[PDB]
Amino acid sequence: MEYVSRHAIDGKFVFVDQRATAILAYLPQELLGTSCYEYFHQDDIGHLAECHRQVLQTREKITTNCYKFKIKDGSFITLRSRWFSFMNPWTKEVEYIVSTNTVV
Ligand SMILES: CCc1ccc(OC[C@@H](F)CO)c2occc12
Secondary structure, three states: OEEEEEEOOOOEEEEEOOHHHHHHOOOHHHOOOOEHHHHEOOOOHHHHHHHHHHHOOOOOOEEOOOEEEEOOOOOEEEEEEEEEEEEOOOOOOEEEEEEEEEEO
């Protein structure tokens, strides 16, 4: 049903939990360090980038629209994600975003 990923503030995968493989067929090392945008269907990039701009400016859960994500075999699956951007309480800077990614 769902898996969790962590992203740098630019959208790069920096952590992928073990549930990702059963869902996307990628092992973690095929995603880590790559840009989330490389996997989006080009019809979804616009609204996903809009959520990107918004999750960086608030601590409230951002929920994406549905969007398509390219899996290892080239096909696309439909996801919906819940994002929380975490701010270092000391430095006051956002160090990563935690994305819970739900199938269809
Ligand atoms: C850096 C904020 C962020 C987190 C997660 C994203 O997508 C997750 C998918 F790649 C997994 O299905 C994002 O997309 C654009 C910005 C973005």
